[PDB]
Amino acid sequence: LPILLDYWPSMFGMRARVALREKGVEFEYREEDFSNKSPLLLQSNPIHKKIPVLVHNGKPVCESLNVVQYVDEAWPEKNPFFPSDPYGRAQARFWADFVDKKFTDAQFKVWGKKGEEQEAGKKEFIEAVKILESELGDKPYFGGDSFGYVDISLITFSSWFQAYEKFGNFSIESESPKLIAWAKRCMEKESVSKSLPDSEKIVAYAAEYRKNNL
Amino acid sequence: LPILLDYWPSMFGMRARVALREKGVEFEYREEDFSNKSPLLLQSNPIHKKIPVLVHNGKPVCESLNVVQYVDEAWPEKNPFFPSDPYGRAQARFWADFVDKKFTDAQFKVWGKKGEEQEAGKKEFIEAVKILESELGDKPYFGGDSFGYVDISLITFSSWFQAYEKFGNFSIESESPKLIAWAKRCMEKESVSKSLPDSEKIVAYAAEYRKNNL
Amino acid sequence: TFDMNRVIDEFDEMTRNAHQVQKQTLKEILLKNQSAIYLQNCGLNGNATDPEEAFKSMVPLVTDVELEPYIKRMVDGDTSPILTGHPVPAISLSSGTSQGRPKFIPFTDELMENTLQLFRTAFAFRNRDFPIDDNGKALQFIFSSKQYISTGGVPVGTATTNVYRNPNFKAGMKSITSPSCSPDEVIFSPDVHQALYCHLLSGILFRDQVQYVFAVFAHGLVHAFRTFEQVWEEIVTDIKDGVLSNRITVPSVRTAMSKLLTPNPELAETIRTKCMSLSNWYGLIPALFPNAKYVYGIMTGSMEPYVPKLRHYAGDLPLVSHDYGSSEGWIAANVTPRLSPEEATFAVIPNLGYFEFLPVSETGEGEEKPVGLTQVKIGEEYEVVITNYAGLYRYRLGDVVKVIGFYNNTPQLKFICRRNLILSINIDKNTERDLQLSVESAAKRLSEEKIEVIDFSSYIDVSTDPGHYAIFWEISGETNEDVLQDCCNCLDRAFIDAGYVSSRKCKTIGALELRVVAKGTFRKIQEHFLGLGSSAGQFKMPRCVKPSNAKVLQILCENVVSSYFSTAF
Ligand SMILES: Nc1ncnc2c1ncn2[C@@H]1O[C@H](COP(=O)(O)OP(=O)(O)OP(=O)(O)O)[C@@H](O)[C@H]1O
Ligand SMILES: N[C@@H](CCC(=O)N[C@@H](CS)C(=O)NCC(=O)O)C(=O)O
Ligand SMILES: N[C@@H](CCC(=O)N[C@@H](CS)C(=O)NCC(=O)O)C(=O)O
Ligand SMILES: CC/C=C\C[C@H]1C(=O)CC[C@@H]1CC(=O)O
Ligand SMILES: [Mg+2]
């Protein structure tokens, strides 16, 4: 069976759960206490000790966007995430890599930092969601005619959207509606509809961090 | 013929150059002026305006790693870059990610920083050069029985190996003869013996950048 | 003035009089309304000496579809009187569907008289069996907090809301109930799921004098008590420190709850003790107010599944079955409320309206002409055909009931039913599957908050330009506004067909407005439909409202717990 080493507040971890559930593999979840990284994890990635990790055939597969590539390639017969052309594949890796830079880091600023730091990542995330909303443009999704690669990549970010609107004291929808819009659209898939934690608790996890570093 | 939008000291650009030339593909090389970026670079990349990007079939593909994967995926007939099994391609990918960030951070800190930063960066580079050296077990390439995917992503640092030697008070050869000499094997390849510009030009450039920013 | 023995004697008298007053009911329904244009097609003028025969030989039966357009002329700009007459003070919807579509039904104050009387009388016989205290109160999970005005500028209305916000509800029910545990403003609160919470709270308040727990339906009770299992610790916390929970947002209900509250620590100890002392919450109802004579509600037909989990809820306490009638015409009373739910039956009170039945005697169905209510046969199954003061005249409501016996001269009735189910081809749907899909797709945004979507409905507005879609949901919990906007955005985004896409991408039909409404809203719909006069084949819900559907609609506008137009588009 595929064993996942995940962490309930990991947008990344969720990328793997969503990835696995999307294709249609039954798998076991394991909850990490990162204060105590478990013996099979420190043997999966002895230096990063980072997750999500998928152990298949006694082989640890790590880094989340990598893991979903792995999800694709491990079972190449039903639900592909890429299209058949190499270029569209390149598009979906491109925009996946867009998700991993200013976007992830901006949200990290907005529920992790305050003040002078806060408004920068605050103007970062709207710009991010704004280019985001342009590139979504029309497609129900992102990296295919159906549920694609990067659809998995940033759908797991849509449970933090509550924590953003609250610490940020914002509303990321009036500036760019069609994104969060598409997000709860994507939530209908059981890939993410069973693979993402409750957002109020996420809000509470952000709240814990926020109260811890002031 | 595919247009390449590129920067001559760019290690990521050399990765693209190396992919196309190893392929037997014939392309037109274009230099960019980040001062005054050409209309295709701006009409291809509305967002990061970065390089390299290859336009083919009337379609722009950006990021070095993503181009290399497009290089492989559009021309899979002679020199496949990845192994057949998804797991080897898997290892190749997260290792390409390792060189991409931790190693590129560490080296940038070597050629682009000073003081304490320069010193912690040396420690990381010599450790990072050791774990790369560790991965190979001690193998000749990285991504295939011949020239591979992770070789491509890591070879273009061999042009700046000298720059890390020179700025960082460090011999990568006496400490890890195998990586520099891995690179020096790759140098009998026209892929590296034409794509990676002289070490003299790049050491002079790193120093030129050294002059401009404080 | 409500007494026990005089009314029942008048009602025994009345029930034995069943023929004179069935016939007089008919006299009255047409003497008041000789003027129907419907009947002009029939050639009616009243009086005569073959009046009952002239009615059962000259007027054709009518269906939901043929009945749609006339009352439709009543409600929308043309304030015009038609099938019965009067431009009525409220209008209806009907369980099952009018070819998939909306069915309109008129309300008149007469129907309110019918209400009160059924309820003085039903309460007489019950307190005759399950006697109460006259200085006590009740746990009534009743709401009627929503009240719109139709696109014609005429009010149109649900049973419950038309009962409770009516002028004579409060004066008239005063002698026939134990004082409602909740302020009328929280009964009539814009946020009713929160009000449901303050309805537990309220019914839980004067618990010692409470003589019964009430919902029309066991599922009403069962959702109230499973809800209790969810939020009991929170409720402690609410009343405890004198501060209602942050869950509560709407101002008037918040001011009302604060109008009742001060810091009071002592009672938490007690409630925590008893609540953790039980076995998975069996017998929680006698546990709450242990001196209740009963749990009350309908207990036959398509809710029989809800008797067990509620029996688990009610413990050893007697489950009394609620009587049987509605706005489309009230039918019956259980004057022996002591009978078990499984054997429970409701006797037909004769000035309700003028009812005939279509016997199934032959095979399924069988081509027989109607016989009178006391010309009906015992043990046989007939479907109720309705004539009353509510827009209905020898109408086919389309649902099957059995006669088990006679309470003196009036037949007793048994419901083994559920659905008046066969449908036909719709146009409110935007595909029903899409409608539901849209609900579900947007909902999981809420489901991030540990909830699932318990119910949903919708409506089309051509009063506006561009005319727009209106989505209504029922959930288990409250949530902040941002997600609700996101949510409305997805109902706008969840109709997969090319057409909807054309209309609101151009903008010739309006953006979709999701007015999320509260808990029990659709329970109201179920509860007012199955008890509705005909036969339990009533359970339903039409999921989308053309202008010609109304009952769900009274429950639609005022309790916009949130109503948001898409900031998308
Ligand atoms: N079973 C019943 N439950 C609640 N109210 C009933 C019932 N039967 C008759 N009524 C009465 O009908 C009158 C109001 O219901 P009402 O007739 O307004 O709605 P309507 O516009 O006819 O349509 P509907 O109730 O089907 O929505 C009330 O005065 C009310 O007491
Ligand atoms: N690119 C990685 C990023 C993962 C990452 O940084 N994970 C953090 C979650 S904050 C982690 O696992 N940290 C381990 C720890 O905090 O101990 C992925 O998406 O999998
Ligand atoms: N993911 C990109 C990031 C590359 C990057 O930063 N490239 C440099 C070329 S040296 C660039 O384009 N810099 C633009 C700038 O100076 O802002 C890649 O690997 O190509
Ligand atoms: C006739 C009285 C109308 C109000 C009755 C409502 C209640 O209070 C319980 C449901 C009942 C509906 C019903 O008896 O059909
Ligand atoms: Mg109504």
PDB file of C-alpha atoms and ligand atoms in Angstrom, chain A residues 10 12 15 34 50-52 63-64, ligand 2:
ATOM      1  CA  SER A  10       0.388  21.257   4.759  1.00  0.00           C
ATOM      2  CA  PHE A  12       1.829  20.687   0.064  1.00  0.00           C
ATOM      3  CA  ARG A  15      -1.273  18.462  -2.908  1.00  0.00           C
ATOM      4  CA  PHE A  34       7.627  17.331  13.376  1.00  0.00           C
ATOM      5  CA  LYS A  50      10.172  17.538   4.888  1.00  0.00           C
ATOM      6  CA  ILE A  51       6.789  16.229   3.719  1.00  0.00           C
ATOM      7  CA  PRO A  52       4.544  14.966   1.981  1.00  0.00           C
ATOM      8  CA  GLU A  63       8.650  17.132  -2.681  1.00  0.00           C
ATOM      9  CA  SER A  64       4.939  17.692  -3.299  1.00  0.00           C
TER      10      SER A  64
HETATM   11  N1  LIG D   2       8.008  22.187  -1.856  1.00  0.00           N
HETATM   12  C1  LIG D   2       7.635  21.456  -0.662  1.00  0.00           C
HETATM   13  C2  LIG D   2       7.519  22.435   0.485  1.00  0.00           C
HETATM   14  C3  LIG D   2       7.220  21.658   1.724  1.00  0.00           C
HETATM   15  C4  LIG D   2       7.512  22.360   2.996  1.00  0.00           C
HETATM   16  O1  LIG D   2       8.227  23.355   3.106  1.00  0.00           O
HETATM   17  N2  LIG D   2       6.888  21.750   4.069  1.00  0.00           N
HETATM   18  C5  LIG D   2       6.992  22.269   5.362  1.00  0.00           C
HETATM   19  C6  LIG D   2       5.574  22.584   5.739  1.00  0.00           C
HETATM   20  S1  LIG D   2       5.665  24.245   6.364  1.00  0.00           S
HETATM   21  C7  LIG D   2       7.406  21.121   6.226  1.00  0.00           C
HETATM   22  O2  LIG D   2       7.116  19.981   5.913  1.00  0.00           O
HETATM   23  N3  LIG D   2       8.157  21.435   7.348  1.00  0.00           N
HETATM   24  C8  LIG D   2       8.599  20.406   8.243  1.00  0.00           C
HETATM   25  C9  LIG D   2       8.727  21.100   9.566  1.00  0.00           C
HETATM   26  O3  LIG D   2       8.269  22.284   9.686  1.00  0.00           O
HETATM   27  O4  LIG D   2       9.294  20.487  10.505  1.00  0.00           O
HETATM   28  C10 LIG D   2       6.329  20.703  -0.888  1.00  0.00           C
HETATM   29  O5  LIG D   2       5.463  21.372  -1.463  1.00  0.00           O
HETATM   30  O6  LIG D   2       6.248  19.525  -0.530  1.00  0.00           O
END
